């Protein structure tokens, strides 16, 4: 439904708050998500069709259905560094991509000293 103007005023109200506040923030707060963490999602639903290149998807009808559970370990993260090379075109203006070379590590410990070396797998195109 439409969004009320910011300076909306009238007969019974001198001012109105909450107009343009994003759903992102409304969520984050309502549920008290304090950034990265574990979140329990109750009564998950299935998407007729996927919406993300992620290996697993699930949806929650109402936000109150998402909460946080602080009592479980932090899953290391999937990293990738990547230097790239380019070249300006002889003809005109463009800067072509003539290479890339990522580095990777499928297990980066957020809460532990960095891995040595920093990457297991890697490559270059």
């Amino acid at each position: 439904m439409p969004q009320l103007p910011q300076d909306l005023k009238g007969e019974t109200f001198s001012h109105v708050f909450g107009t343009n506040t994003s759903s992102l923030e409304l969520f984050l707060m309502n549920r008290k998500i304090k950034g990265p963490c574990w979140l329990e999602v109750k009564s998950p639903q299935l998407l007729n069709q996927p919406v993300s290149w992620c290996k697993a998807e699930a949806m929650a009808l109402k936000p109150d259905l998402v909460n946080v559970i602080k009592d479980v370990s932090p899953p290391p993260l999937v990293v990738m560094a990547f230097s790239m090379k380019t070249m300006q075109n002889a003809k005109n203006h463009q800067n072509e991509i003539i290479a890339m070379a990522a580095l990777v590590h499928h297990s980066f410990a957020l809460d532990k000293a960095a891995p040595k070396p920093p990457f297991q797998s890697h490559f270059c195109v």
Binding site: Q88, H93, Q94, N95
Partner: protein
Amino acid sequence: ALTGSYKSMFQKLPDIREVLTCKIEELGSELKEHYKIEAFTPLLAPAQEPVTLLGQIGCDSNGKLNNKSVILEGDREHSSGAQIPVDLSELKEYSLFPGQVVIMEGINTTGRKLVATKLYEGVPLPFYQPTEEDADFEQSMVLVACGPYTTSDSITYDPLLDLIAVINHDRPDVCILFGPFLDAKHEQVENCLLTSPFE
């Protein structure tokens, strides 16, 4: 347009700055409303797509501005005064002069040089809207002349007089006369040989 002598004769760099910036912003602000561009790009932010900068030309040295050395110094509000030289090789029709508030469109990928693609044409102000009273006035004839009003080897002001006479003969409605009445450059005046006080 000013009536008294002045307000001063002492300037605060912190303000000349303020000026030169408004200069560019203002015009810009309106040039943007005319050609209806959507947003100027910082002269320092690189990008592959074509951009529309806002700035004022300027030379990069103490000499005669030229096709090579041109440069654009953006405004404060967008490019917090950054200077990026300009590449014209790729520009067809252009008229440039130092200080020329200009809107340019070209490509700056590295953000260290803009290859101009288009130089918007300057836009002037509307002309005066005549009230009905001004169409009720009759023909007038304005003379107009500007000094020096004397020969560079005499203080006769001869021409001055001739003028006068001519003013009379033709009986003009208005005679707008441009200084120098007493030429700061007239030989005798600069070597202060005159026996009379300037005033």
